[PDB]
Amino acid sequence: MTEYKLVVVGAGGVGKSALTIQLIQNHFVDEYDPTIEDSYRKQVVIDGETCLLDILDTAGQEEYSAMRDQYMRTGEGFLCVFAINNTKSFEDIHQYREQIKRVKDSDDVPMVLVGNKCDLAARTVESRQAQDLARSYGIPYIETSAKTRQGVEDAFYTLVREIRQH
């Protein structure tokens, strides 16, 4: 079937793993074990089409920036994640976006901007700021909570679909 190779990128602790785990395995990971590189594979139905999701969960910890170029070459689309209660995580998105941009040598890489932890009342990144950033990229912005499951399906399936529009 059609296999979609998604990569989840973003700063440490923003919820990349929890998002992926909630999606593929339908539960919330409450603890924080930093990731190096984990791979997930799951067959799903999106717009009547049975497709395979191949999802690479990546390190947001700087102890692993060197591995970035490899995963950015392979992937067909990137879930670019920050957390809405962490302004520095939002400021970190540019580096990921530019890096992806250089690697693929394209201004038109399938990507989705995700502001995670929208359950948390302690917001410092306004939706408006992220809408403006994503607009400059020509991609969607979608808020999520790995904790409540809010928007998690919309995020990943929107990404799958973005890999289609191209």
Ligand X SMILES: Nc1nc2c(ncn2[C@@H]2O[C@H](COP(=O)(O)OP(=O)(O)NP(=O)(O)O)[C@@H](O)[C@H]2O)c(=O)[nH]1
In terms of CB distance, is 28 or 64 closer to Ca ion?
28
C-alpha 2/C-alpha 50 separation (Å) is: 8
Check residue 17 for interaction with Mg ion (CB under 5 A). Answer: yes
Strand order in the sheet with 111-116: 37-46, 49-58, 2-10, 77-83, 111-116, 141-143
Q: In the structure encoding, which two tokens stand for residue 122, read together?
A: 């302690």
By residue count, the chain amounts to 166
In terms of CB distance, is 26 or 39 closer to Ca ion?
26
Cβ-contact 19, 7 below 8 angstroms: no
Check residue 99 for interaction with ligand X (CB under 6 A). Answer: no
**Which range touches ligand X (CB under 6 A), out of 31-39, 47-55, 103-111, 153-161?**
31-39
C-alpha 87/C-alpha 107 separation (Å) is: 25
**Which range touches ligand X (CB under 6 A), out of 29-37, 39-47, 104-112, 155-163?**
29-37
The footprint of Ca ion on this chain (CB under 5 A) covers a number of residues equal to 3
Residues binding ligand X (CB under 6 A): 12-18, 29-32, 34-35, 59-61, 116-117, 119-120, 145-147
